[PDB]
Amino acid sequence: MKVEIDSFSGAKIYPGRGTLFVRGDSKIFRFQNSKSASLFKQRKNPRRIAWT
């Protein structure tokens, strides 16, 4: 098991928790949870969001 960071939010992602998203530019993103993922689908700014 390896521990990661949220491609949106900046959190440790423990195994089989959260999700992953992929993008046809081969790029990978990780999400702890549906919140961050939904912001992502909303194509949002994790630098204007506060709690990141």
Partner: protein, 386 residues
């Protein structure tokens, strides 16, 4: 007519009658086949489930693409505080079924169990096992003899056993109780093991062991009066159905001139009792041990207890168990474990699993931190800290 498209039935008929249970607790309709070769030990145990959590390990299945690779799995906790023995009893054969002839009982009994016999305890004299007690206070007289009365007879022996519930978080204040069959040899010895074990506490660590397969026997959840769609997974009917669609249509033909037992119909869904076999153990629980939650590889003083606690259940201060999977029964329910009936090879009942990591994250949310410490380190100080 020759039903046009010939498909599966819905349902299992061999779980009927789908009804509520006689009891919340699940009796053991059979026990393992004994060999008169062994030491004495039980064939079962009882415990209170508390929830699930998640487990990380490394697979050794030589041919799986995940061989020697990490995986995750889903397990549950079963609070196994040390069972008590209170009395045994004896059974013997007949032409017409095994049959009891004595129930011997200890001298001193916990108040937390004799409440089982009562329904309005708070206004009683408690007056129980008392004229029996005075059978003791003589050397063994009326008592040992029955044990001998059993040894004379009684192919099959069992043990009346109960819990020190009060340690559990719950406020049931009424222990449960049950039988267990014994599976050493030498019934004359079995009873003697027991006669020693009267009022003597027992822990499962003696009995079960890690990487062992078992069965589980318990009473599934309750949901209640349900419809023919869910209770049986029948179809939902289309949009333009008069008088509801969450139905079954043709419960039967003209002739036969009745309704068959084989038809999806409404009725209770849950509080049944079920038999869940072959769920491996991955770890034993030690109430008198911090780092129950640890592994070889993780190594923090973490227990199994999650941050903010289990849902509806709470702490795991007692001993405990970890078993692979999702077992029948819900939080706070008494669960009758049981050793298997037989010898499963399977190339999976034989794997010495080692644990890598155990998730303690809160389940009252979408948990991040295993722990306040970790949590504190990451976020840092707050307006609460000084």
């Amino acid at each position: 007519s020759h039903r046009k498209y010939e498909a599966p039935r819905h349902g299992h008929l061999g779980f009927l009658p789908r009804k509520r249970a006689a009891s919340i607790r699940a009796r053991v309709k059979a026990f393992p086949k004994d060999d008169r070769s062994k030491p004495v030990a039980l064939t079962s145990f009882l415990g209170y489930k508390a929830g699930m959590t998640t487990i990380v390990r490394d697979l050794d299945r030589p041919g799986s693409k995940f061989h020697k690779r990490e995986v995750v799995e889903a397990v549950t906790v079963v609070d196994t505080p040390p069972v008590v023995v209170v009395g045994v009893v004896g059974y013997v054969e007949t032409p017409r079924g095994l049959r009891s002839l004595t129930t011997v009982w200890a001298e001193h009994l916990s108040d937390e169990v004799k409440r089982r016999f009562y329904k309005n305890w708070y206004k009683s004299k408690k007056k129980a096992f008392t004229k029996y007690s005075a059978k003791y206070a003589q050397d063994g007289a009326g008592i040992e003899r029955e044990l001998a009365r059993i040894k004379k007879y009684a192919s099959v022996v069992r043990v009346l056993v109960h819990t020190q519930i009060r340690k559990t978080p719950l406020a049931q204040k009424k222990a449960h109780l049950a039988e267990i069959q014994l599976n050493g040899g030498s019934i004359s010895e079995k009873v003697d093991w027991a006669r020693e074990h009267f009022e003597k506490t027992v822990a499962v660590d003696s009995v079960f062991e890690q990487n062992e397969m078992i069965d589980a026997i318990a009473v599934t959840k309750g949901h209640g009066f349900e419809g023919v769609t869910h209770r049986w997974g029948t179809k939902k009917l289309p949009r333009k159905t008069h008088r509801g669609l969450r139905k079954v249509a043709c419960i039967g033909a003209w002739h036969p001139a009745h309704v068959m037992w084989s038809v999806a119909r409404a009725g209770q869904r849950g509080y049944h009792s079920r038999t869940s076999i072959n769920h491996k153990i991955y770890r034993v629980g030690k109430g008198d041990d911090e780092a129950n939650g640890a592994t070889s590889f993780d190594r923090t003083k973490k227990t199994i207890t999650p941050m903010g606690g289990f849902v509806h259940y709470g702490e795991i201060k007692n001993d405990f168990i970890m078993v692979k999977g999702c077992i029948p029964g819900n939080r706070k329910r008494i669960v009758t474990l049981r050793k298997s009936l037989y010898t499963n090879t399977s190339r999976k009942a034989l794997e010495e699993v080692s644990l890598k990591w155990i998730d303690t994250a809160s389940k009252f949310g979408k948990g991040r931190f295993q722990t306040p410490a970790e949590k504190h380190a990451f976020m840092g100080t707050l307006k609460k800290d000084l």
